[PDB]
Each structure stands twice: as structure tokens, then as C-alpha cells.
């Protein structure tokens, strides 16, 4: 991903205020509610029958933390996302068979969650910079 | 295919937009042009600078069209036929661009109306904007 | 002493959802939007038009009163009306001028927005029975490529995207419905 | 959104399948499992070898469901609700798999019925299979 | 793209019987009819108002030959499609702004045209091998 | 001397498109598919059921004749019927055996396919008025997670995907409609 220093600055500043205990769980939970076929990959997580059961599920929250941790790892290696995400790419493709279109959907749900948490602070320039990051992570995973 | 609950969710959330319709439509377009610059190639005749009056006026038309689509959610091919004529037959907009604008409308709604943007409402708005996008990109004349 | 003009504009002006075809409002100076049941002189012409599949149940017709006739016919109306196309800002149409000659030539012109002398359509033919003139617009057959059933003056003034209401690439029913409807002129 | 001509095109082309319904459905499934092996993960309980009787019988059910969808093309959410219950609520099939099966059904029709597979008919079948796919992957209960 | 020697054999044998004057024009023409927003990129080609006008358009036939020529060039460099399609990738992205989903659609329309021309000879194994090739070309262009 | 059983099976067996719920055919040995207008003893129970939104205009009801009653009640019917679920091959349901005890316990059992002694549902309660027994199935409230309104014997015999007709993850109207309808037993 090619971000200008100002875009990298905007991304890093907003990422520093992210509640790492909730944002990941909210993005994963919203992926499961909005694109409901994604629940197939998480069948063992238990009750996913309603939006409230999904969002409040302890396994959804714990796994969402791991996902957010990986997006953060992408922020450290923007010029080599392919190499950084190599192991995860192998896991999601060869083992899990996740169609790569779902990686783009998860990145866009994460942008929505950031907008929902930050409101007016998630300005159009700040979103544009995050769009480069989430496209880079989804392409690296694919 | 929208469920009955999706329809009531979209009507309730879009009803909270009200007087801010143009403002939200303009912001969604601005977010689209800035995040996905290829979408600017559909508006070569526009002043695309930030705060452009042309972008503001266009945003009000987009928001008003969505208000009409919400009101006639069970008869959208008929209600939006001239918009399908423009987007599918004349402009021939690639359907990917509708996913981009729909995402930017969701982002704007999440930023401005956090109380309304519940996971259930986000899901219903996503399907609704996908159905509006299918109508505007299909040739059914 | 005068002439009344009756015109439904186009079949596409009679869609169930009024954003889907030309919509008229703010009629003045002798122009009036009249319910078809009260504009009986246009009843038979209106029933023969090509309308969209999703057609309005109760339609209004444009009626321009107090036209001046010079008898060949040269008729001018003082009426003005606002035409809205979809989500656009309105355009005033006024100074309707109809010239008819030799039973098979002539044209309907108007001022459209800030532009005067805009031909809306050329006349294919017209006939007079009693005190009524029936005017048929000259419309090319819809074959292939761009089909343009209105005069180029109109669409060149409107521009590419507002001309989506007045032209089409295809010959489907709802596109044929965009063509100008015939006129009925009642001489009094 | 299907046009009136799309509907008449799909009914005419699918009507030419007739007694070969099961054969074409079975071949489309075989083409899918072989071309896109990830789709096999939805059928772990099947014998997926070539000429498998289970794949043949399944192909006849898929083809019969498409015959019903063609017959009720203007009321598909109602006509196919139990298939939406199975595919969207129970199996939770990823929509990409429906694009894969739809492509393999098109390939089978092109191979077996070249006189019917005109560019116009190919276009109408593609939209029809996309609308059946949207119904079977949407939760509208 | 990783094809076994038998799959490469099946691809090469069928490709040798392809009518290079028609198949390309049919694939491009069918792309324009089936996915009609693709006509936006070829506005200067003239009459595309009906399926017959599209299929019979001389510019559609001539351009389709060029497209088929590029897929053939991919058959020569299956182990380095990214490097081979580098110039075309730059042309379709930086200059033409073609969304990469259209490359997948064109590859699938080309598979349909091969099936339409070869009938029973376009067997499920032969299609599976062509699917690896068209995915590789579309990914290389993206 | 005998008992007739009236049962609509489930509200979901009355979808406008019969592939969308259980469908019955090939009734024999005293079982009969009867139009609701000719099975008046079931009229009031049938009207109180939960049906899908897209409901059939004219419905048939299962009627099992020549039941044997031992009076607590133990009633057995000789009837057999074929049940088709969607696009599946039919399954014969036969040997219906109803046990009722203490006004609030009991169950309806059947042979389903090659498996005998399959409980279809447990009885929540039953009442007798004149020569008619009204039997109410025991159905758990639909709250969250997997909702199973039929006995586990039935769904475990049917398997995961055929059990989509008998259970749901959600509490939507069309899912509630899958629950067993009450029985009406007429003693003669
Ligand atoms: C696009 C961004 C994504 C990122 C950054 C991401 C990251 C991760 C990480 C860090 C793990 C744990 C790896 C390990 O410790 O072994 C994981 C596991 C997993 N992911 Fe993703 N993932 C993404 C998208 C998806 C999508 C879209 C799906 C499915 C729709 C998915 C399904 C799974 C599953 C099923 C597991 C295993 C969980 C379990 O059973 O414990 N992932 N992912
Ligand atoms: C939710 C989806 C959309 C809605 C509701 C929508 C609605 C509208 C409306 C109401 C108009 C004005 C029509 C009139 O004046 O009658 C319009 C025009 C237009 N739309 Fe869209 N649109 C959508 C998506 C898109 C997308 C994704 C693009 C391209 C990236 C696009 C490009 C255009 C263009 C170029 C015009 C002409 C603008 C002008 O010249 O003023 N639209 N649209
Ligand atoms: C996926 C496989 C594709 C291949 C192998 C391919 C190949 C080519 C080739 C060989 C050229 C000519 C390059 C030159 O000589 O300068 C070309 C040009 C072009 N392609 Fe593609 N292309 C593909 C897909 C697409 C798609 C999907 C679109 C649009 C929907 C598209 C639109 C164009 C346009 C607009 C030109 C320029 C034509 C002109 O104006 O002369 N291409 N392509
Ligand atoms: C055109 C699209 C499709 C149609 C019309 C269709 C139709 C059907 C039908 C009729 C059944 C049997 C239902 C019954 O017995 O009542 C079925 C079952 C099933 N479908 Fe589909 N289907 C489609 C696409 C898919 C796709 C894309 C997948 C996954 C790759 C899939 C996976 C399944 C599975 C796993 C079953 C259960 C099979 C069994 O256990 O016998 N379906 N489908």
C-alpha cells in the first residue's frame, strides 16, 4: 500500500485511540450480521441466531481482538503486506476456503465501525487513508 | 430480497435523516470521490473540489431519490425506471461504483447517526442499497 | 377570435411515478393543466398515444388558451409552463408558435429556458374537420442506434443527460412512449 | 431486474431442456466440483466421484427447482422460500458458489443446446440465474 | 497458474482448433451483451444498441482478435503471467480504469464461447483446465 | 366403535407452493386427504393455527378413519400416507399411536420410513367435550438458538437438512408455522 506521510499520520493518530477490546469484536460481529453466510466459518462459536446474540457472543469478541491485531500488524509493514500476511493467507485459503471477496467486506465493515466510533472525527480524508490500508490487507490475504 | 423487518428498519433509519438529506448525500459523494478517485471519471463536467456547490446540489438529488426508493421499496423497478434509464442505458455505470457509493452512504450514516446505526439496521440498509443498485444497473425496459 | 391548444406532451409524461417522465407545473398566462375528463376535445387523440407500461390512472393535459390565429395557419399562444425532468430544476417553456402549411409541413416552436426559437417537432401532416385541427408530428421509425423523435434544437438545448427523457438507444415500449403526442387545436 | 424479453427468453430456452433436465443439472454440478474444487466442501456426505448416482440424483433436484423458478419467475421469493431457508438459513452458502454453479449451468447449456444459446438468451439466463441466486442467499423470512 | 502436464496438454490441443477470426469477437461481443455496462469502455465502436448490432460490429470483431491474441500469449508464459501482462495491466488500470471484476467476467464469457463452439468436446476436465488459465490471466491483469 | 383423527400436520404444510412445506400424497388404509370444507369437525382448530404468510387458498386435512380406542385413552389408526419434503423422495408415515393420560400427558407416535416407535410430539394437554378430544402438542417457546417444536425422535430420523422443515434458528412467522398443529379426535 502507498500512503503519503500525511495519510500515514492520519491513520496512526486515529489507530492510537481505538478501543482494542471492542472495535474488533464489533467489526467481526457486524460482518456476521450484515453478510450472514460468513457465520458458516464460525459455526462452533455458539448462538449467532440474532444480531444481539452475535454481538454479545464472547467468542465473537475474543476472535475480533485477534482480527484487529492483524490489521494493526499491517500498519507496521505497509510496504510488504504480502510477505507479512503470508501465513494467514495460507490459513484462510488452503485451510479455511474463505472466498477473498469476504476480506474486502470485513475491511469495509471495519471502516463503518471506525466511523461509528469516531463520528465527525472520521473525516473524508481520514476514511480515504483507511481505504488504502484495508484494500492492501484484503489483497495481501487473497 | 428484503425481509419485512429490513423494510421497517430502512424506513425508520432513513426517516431520521430528514432535513439533513442533502448534507448526507453530499458528504457520501465527497467520501466516494476522495476514497475511490476512479468514480470521479463519471463526473468530468463537475467542479469536484471540496465544498463544490455542484457536488452539494447533486447530493441533494441522490438523497431525494433514496427517499423515493424507501417510500416505494416494494415497487422500486417502476418507481425508479427513469433513474435506471439514466444509470444503466445512458451512463452505463459499472456496478462496482454502486457498492462504493453505498459503502460511503453507510459510513456517513454511521458517523452522523450512531444511535440509529445498530448492527440490524446496518444489515437492512446494506441490502436496501444493494436492491436500489440492482435496479439502477439493470436494463428492464 | 381565438384557438385553444390541447397537448399531452408525450406518453412518457403520464407515468404513474411523475419523476419518470416530463412533469409540468406553474402553468400561467392562459396555460392550464386540465384533467382529461374536462378536455374532451383531446379524448380521441389521447387514447391513441403510446404510453409507458406503468401509466398514471388519472391524467392532466396541457391546455393553452387565448391563442391568436392568422389564416396555411400561424398560431401563437401566450401561455407559460414549468417542465421538470426527474430530479432537475424546472425549465420554463413559453411562446408556443405553430406554423402549418400545404397540409403536410410546418412545426411547433417554443422558448425553452433562456433560448428562443427552439423547434420542438416538425409537422408530418395536419387535417381540419369542423373547427378542429389535428396535428401529427414527424417521427422517424425506431430502427437501430440512437432514436430521436423530437427536433435536435430541443435535445441540443437540454444536453445529453436531460435528453434521456427525449431519446433512446433502444426501441422498447417505454422509449417509444417518449415521442411527442399529436396536437388538437380548437378554433373559436 | 428481468425485462419482459428476458423472461420470455429464459422460458423458451429452459423449455428446450425437457427430459434432459437431470442430465444437464448433473453435468453442471460435475463441472462445478471439478473446475472449482472448494464447492465440494458443501457436500462432504456425497460420493463425489464421476458418474456418482448421488450427484446424478442431486442434479435432477437442482434442474427441477430451476423449472419451478422459471414457471414462477415473477414470484420467486414466495415460490422458492424453503430453498432460501435451506441455502441461506441452514447451509449458509457463500454467494460466490452460486456464481460458480450458474456459470457451469451456462457452459452446459452452451455445449448441449448451441442453437438456443444466442447472445440475447445467454444474457437473459445470466440475469435469471443471478435473481435465483439472490433469492436462495437472502434471509427474507 | 499451475496446470498439470495433462491439463496443459488438453488446453493446447483445444486452443489449436480455435477459429482465431471469430472466437475473440464472440467473447468480446457476448461480454458487451451480457454485462452491458462494459459497452462504456467501447463507446467509440459505434452501434451497440442490440445484440445483433454488437455481434456484427466490425470494430468488436477486430478488437476481439486482439483480446484472443493476449489469452494465447498467456498460454506461452503460464509460470509468469504477472510479468507477461505487466504493460496491459498498466493500460487497463492506470489508463482505462477497468474494474478487475470485468476481467473475470470476460474469462468466463470466453469459457462459454469455447463450450458453444466445441460442444461435447468441451468436457468437464477440459473446462477445469481452462478455468485455471482464465483465472490466471484475470489475476495477472488485475 | 371407532375414532377419526383430524390433523393439518403443521401450518407450514399449507403453503401456496407445496414444495415449501410438508406435502402428503398416496393416503391409504383409512387415511384420506380431505378438503377442510368437508372436515367441519376440524374447522375451529384449523383456524387458530400459525400459517405462513404465503398460505394456500383451499386446504386438505389428513383424516384417519377406523381408529381403535381403548378407554386415559390409547388410540391406534391403520392409515398410511406419503410425506414429501421439498424435492426429496417420499417417506411413508403409518401406525399412528396416540396415548393420552391424566389430562396433561401422552404423545403421538408413528412409524416414519423404516423406523418404528418415532415420537412426533409430546402432549401438553387434552380435553374431551361430547364425543370429541382436542389434543394440544407440547411446544417450547421460541426464544433464541435452535428452536425445536417437534420431538427429537422425528428430526434425528430425518437428518439435518430434511429437519429444516421441522426446526429453525429464528422465530419468524414462517418458522413458527413449522410447529405441529393440534389434533381433533372424534369418537363414534
Ligand atoms: C480480512 C481480514 C481478516 C484478517 C486480518 C483475519 C485475521 C485472522 C487471524 C489473526 C486469525 C487467527 C489465526 C491464528 O492465530 O491461527 C484468523 C482466523 C480465522 N479467520 Fe480470519 N481474518 C480476516 C478475514 C476473515 C474472513 C472474511 C473470514 C470468514 C468469512 C475469516 C474466518 C476465519 C476463521 C474461520 C478463523 C479460525 C477461527 C477459529 O476457529 O478459531 N477471516 N483470522
Ligand atoms: C444509490 C445510488 C444512486 C442513486 C440513488 C443515484 C441517483 C441519481 C439522481 C437522482 C441523479 C439525477 C437525475 C436527474 O436529475 O433526474 C443522478 C445522476 C447521475 N448519477 Fe447517480 N445515483 C446513484 C449512483 C451513482 C453512481 C454509483 C454513479 C457513478 C459513480 C452515478 C453517476 C451519476 C451521474 C454521472 C449523474 C449525472 C449528474 C449530472 O450531470 O448532474 N450515480 N443519480
Ligand atoms: C480479461 C482479459 C482481457 C484481455 C486479455 C485484454 C486485452 C487487451 C488488449 C490486447 C488490448 C489492446 C492493447 C494495445 O494494443 O494497446 C486491449 C485494449 C482495451 N481493452 Fe482489454 N483486455 C481484457 C479485458 C478488458 C475488459 C474486461 C475491458 C472492459 C470492460 C477492456 C477494455 C479495453 C479497452 C477500452 C481497450 C482499448 C480499445 C481501444 O479503444 O482501441 N479490456 N485489451
Ligand atoms: C441455481 C442454484 C441452486 C439451486 C436451484 C439449488 C437447488 C437445490 C435443491 C432443489 C436442493 C434439494 C432440496 C430438497 O431436497 O428439498 C438443494 C440442496 C442442496 N444444495 Fe443447492 N441449489 C443451488 C445452488 C447451490 C450451491 C451453489 C451450493 C453450494 C456450492 C448448494 C449446496 C446444496 C447442498 C449442500 C444441498 C443439500 C444436498 C443433500 O444433502 O442432498 N446449492 N439445492
Amino acid at each position: 500500500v502507498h500512503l503519503t506521510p500525511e495519510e500515514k499520520s492520519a491513520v496512526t493518530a486515529l489507530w492510537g485511540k481505538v478501543n482494542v477490546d471492542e472495535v474488533g469484536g464489533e467489526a467481526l460481529g457486524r460482518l456476521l450480521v450484515v453478510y450472514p453466510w460468513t457465520q458458516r466459518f464460525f459455526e462452533s462459536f455458539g448462538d449467532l441466531s440474532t444480531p444481539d446474540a452475535v454481538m454479545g457472543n464472547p467468542k465473537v469478541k475474543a476472535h475480533g481482538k485477534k482480527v484487529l491485531g492483524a490489521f494493526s500488524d499491517g500498519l507496521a509493514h505497509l510496504d510488504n503486506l504480502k510477505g507479512t500476511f503470508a501465513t494467514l493467507s495460507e490459513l484462510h485459503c488452503d485451510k479455511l476456503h474463505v472466498d477473498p471477496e469476504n476480506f474486502r467486506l470485513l475491511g469495509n465493515v471495519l471502516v463503518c465501525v471506525l466511523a461509528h466510533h469516531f463520528g465527525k472525527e472520521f473525516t473524508p480524508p481520514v476514511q480515504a487513508a483507511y481505504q488504502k490500508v484495508v484494500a492492501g490487507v484484503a489483497n495481501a490475504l487473497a | 430480497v428484503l425481509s419485512p423487518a429490513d423494510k421497517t428498519n430502512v424506513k425508520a433509519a432513513w426517516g431520521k435523516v430528514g432535513a439533513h438529506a442533502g448534507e448526507y448525500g453530499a458528504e457520501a459523494l465527497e467520501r466516494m470521490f476522495l476514497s475511490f478517485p476512479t468514480t470521479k471519471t463519471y463526473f468530468p463536467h463537475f467542479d469536484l473540489s471540496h465544498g463544490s456547490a455542484q457536488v452539494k446540489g447533486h447530493g441533494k438529488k441522490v438523497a431525494d431519490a433514496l427517499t423515493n426508493a424507501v417510500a416505494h421499496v416494494d415497487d422500486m423497478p417502476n418507481a425508479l425506471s427513469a433513474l435506471s434509464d439514466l444509470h444503466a442505458h445512458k451512463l452505463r455505470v459499472d456496478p462496482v461504483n454502486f457498492k462504493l457509493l453505498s459503502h460511503c452512504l453507510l459510513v456517513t450514516l454511521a458517523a452522523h447517526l450512531p444511535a440509529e446505526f445498530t448492527p440490524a439496521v446496518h444489515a437492512s440498509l446494506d441490502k436496501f442499497l444493494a436492491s436500489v443498485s440492482t435496479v439502477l444497473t439493470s436494463k428492464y425496459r | 377570435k381565438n384557438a385553444d391548444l390541447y397537448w399531452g406532451f408525450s406518453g412518457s409524461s403520464h407515468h404513474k411515478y411523475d419523476h419518470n417522465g416530463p412533469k409540468f407545473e406553474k402553468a400561467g398566462k392562459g396555460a392550464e393543466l386540465t384533467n382529461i375528463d374536462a378536455a374532451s376535445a383531446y379524448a380521441e387523440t389521447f387514447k391513441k398515444g403510446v404510453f409507458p407500461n406503468n401509466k398514471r390512472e388519472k391524467s392532466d393535459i396541457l391546455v393553452f388558451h387565448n391563442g391568436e390565429v392568422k389564416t396555411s395557419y400561424q398560431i401563437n399562444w401566450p401561455g407559460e409552463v414549468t417542465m421538470k425532468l426527474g430530479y432537475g430544476d424546472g425549465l420554463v417553456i413559453k411562446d408556443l408558435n405553430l406554423m402549418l402549411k400545404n397540409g403536410n409541413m410546418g412545426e411547433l416552436k417554443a422558448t425553452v429556458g433562456e433560448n428562443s426559437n427552439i423547434t420542438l417537432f416538425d409537422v408530418q401532416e395536419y387535417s381540419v374537420s369542423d373547427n378542429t385541427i389535428t396535428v401529427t408530428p414527424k417521427i422517424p421509425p425506431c430502427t437501430t442506434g440512437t432514436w430521436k423523435p423530437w427536433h435536435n434544437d430541443l435535445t441540443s438545448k437540454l444536453g445529453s443527460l436531460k435528453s434521456v427523457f427525449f431519446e433512446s438507444y433502444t426501441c422498447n415500449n417505454d422509449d417509444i412512449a417518449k415521442k411527442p403526442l399529436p396536437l388538437t387545436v380548437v378554433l373559436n
Side-chain angles (χ1 to χ4, degrees), chain A residues 3-81 83-89 91-142, chain B, chain C residues 2-46 48-57 59-69 71-100 102-113 115-188:
Chain A
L3 271 70
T4 66
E6 289 180 33
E7 284 177 318
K8 198 192 169 42
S9 204
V11 163
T12 304
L14 192 98
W15 201 253
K17 299 179 167 127
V18 164
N19 180 320
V20 307
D21 293 336
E22 313 274 21
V23 169
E26 279 167 38
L28 182 63
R30 283 177 185 263
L31 176 72
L32 299 185
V33 169
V34 180
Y35 303 109
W37 59 93
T38 65
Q39 293 169 24
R40 184 171 165 99
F41 299 97
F42 302 97
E43 286 182 329
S44 75
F45 282 19
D47 192 2
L48 309 172
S49 56
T50 67
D52 288 352
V54 171
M55 308 308 293
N57 191 305
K59 291 179 175 174
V60 167
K61 301 149 119 56
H63 190 68
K65 284 198 198 183
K66 291 168 158 207
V67 176
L68 194 82
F71 273 99
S72 168
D73 296 353
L75 299 179
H77 301 304
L78 288 171
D79 304 335
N80 199 349
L81 295 171
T84 306
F85 290 106
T87 287
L88 280 185
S89 179
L91 173 67
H92 293 78
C93 170
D94 311 351
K95 188 200 176 58
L96 304 166
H97 304 308
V98 182
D99 188 78
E101 175 63 14
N102 299 300
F103 302 148
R104 194 188 64 89
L105 298 179
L106 177 54
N108 282 347
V109 172
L110 173 62
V111 169
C112 291
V113 167
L114 290 176
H116 194 217
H117 275 253
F118 288 100
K120 309 304 197 285
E121 185 173 344
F122 199 70
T123 67
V126 169
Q127 178 190 354
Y130 269 93
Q131 298 287 171
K132 292 173 164 177
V133 179
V134 300
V137 169
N139 281 155
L141 260 62
Chain B
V1 192
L2 301 175
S3 72
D6 288 328
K7 295 170 202 182
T8 60
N9 282 341
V10 169
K11 289 170 178 295
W14 198 258
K16 294 290 175 209
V17 170
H20 306 291
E23 182 188 330
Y24 298 175
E27 177 169 323
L29 284 177
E30 171 184 16
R31 288 177 180 283
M32 183 184 69
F33 292 147
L34 200 59
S35 294
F36 306 111
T38 50
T39 62
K40 294 188 299 193
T41 70
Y42 285 88
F43 299 80
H45 57 297
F46 268 36
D47 166 4
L48 296 164
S49 58
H50 161 80
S52 149
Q54 213 161 5
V55 169
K56 288 189 186 164
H58 192 62
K60 173 62 165 148
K61 293 175 184 183
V62 171
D64 287 352
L66 290 174
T67 295
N68 285 334
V70 167
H72 303 293
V73 72
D74 290 319
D75 195 31
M76 291 196 282
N78 284 326
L80 308 183
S81 70
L83 288 179
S84 175
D85 199 356
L86 173 62
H87 295 81
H89 300 253
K90 182 66 171 178
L91 296 173
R92 295 177 181 128
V93 177
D94 186 312
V96 69
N97 298 300
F98 280 83
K99 298 189 189 281
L100 304 176
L101 182 54
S102 299
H103 171 68
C104 297
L105 281 160
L106 292 185
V107 167
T108 303
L109 294 173
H112 287 270
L113 295 169
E116 309 296 319
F117 204 71
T118 63
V121 166
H122 176 178
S124 304
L125 284 169
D126 192 78
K127 292 177 69 180
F128 169 71
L129 293 168
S131 287
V132 170
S133 298
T134 292
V135 173
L136 265 58
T137 61
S138 295
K139 292 171 93 171
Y140 54 95
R141 304 176 79 72
Chain C
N2 67 82
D4 294 316
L5 168 71
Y6 293 84
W7 191 28
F9 197 77
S10 66
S12 67
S13 312
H14 302 274
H15 260 278
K16 177 177 168 171
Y17 297 89
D18 58 32
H19 284 84
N20 290 329
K23 176 200 174 162
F24 297 87
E25 58 176 47
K26 300 177 173 59
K29 307 195 191 200
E32 228 202 289
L33 281 161
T34 309
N35 182 262
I36 187 55
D37 304 331
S40 60
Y42 199 59
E44 290 303 287
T45 292
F46 199 60
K48 291 186 293 191
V50 174
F51 293 98
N53 292 306
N54 194 225
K55 175 177 55 174
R56 191 171 298 157
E57 188 218 61
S59 278
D60 276 355
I61 287 303
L62 289 168
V63 185
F64 287 68
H65 294 92
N66 294 324
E68 316 180 29
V69 191
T71 56
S72 153
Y73 297 88
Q74 179 57 242
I75 316 172
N76 289 288
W77 287 268
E80 69 188 3
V81 67
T82 294
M83 175 176 79
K84 297 243 175 113
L85 300 173
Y87 294 78
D89 298 7
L91 267 169
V92 178
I93 301 184
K94 66 186 183 170
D95 309 325
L96 267 65
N97 180 311
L98 176 71
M99 184 273 287
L100 299 172
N102 292 343
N104 69 337
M105 79 198 66
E107 75 274 323
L108 176 61
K109 292 183 167 177
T111 292
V112 175
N115 285 104
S116 68
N117 198 54
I118 297 305
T119 300
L120 302 184
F121 63 81
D122 288 319
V123 167
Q124 169 76 39
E125 67 175 311
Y126 66 90
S127 65
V128 172
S129 181
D130 202 1
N131 70 346
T132 303
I133 313 173
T134 298
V135 178
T136 302
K138 181 178 295 183
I139 306 166
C142 192
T143 59
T144 195
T146 306
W147 183 59
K148 297 151 124 141
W150 294 82
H151 198 276
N152 188 75
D153 283 3
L154 179 54
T155 54
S156 60
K157 156 71 184 63
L158 298 178
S160 231
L161 310 179
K162 293 186 153 201
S163 298
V164 169
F165 287 87
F166 294 88
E167 70 193 18
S168 66
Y169 294 138
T170 48
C171 300
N172 304 308
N173 178 84
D174 285 9
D175 291 310
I176 302 306
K178 304 175 173 170
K179 70 197 178 73
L181 278 165
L183 317 171
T184 292
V185 176
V186 175
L187 310 170
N188 307 300

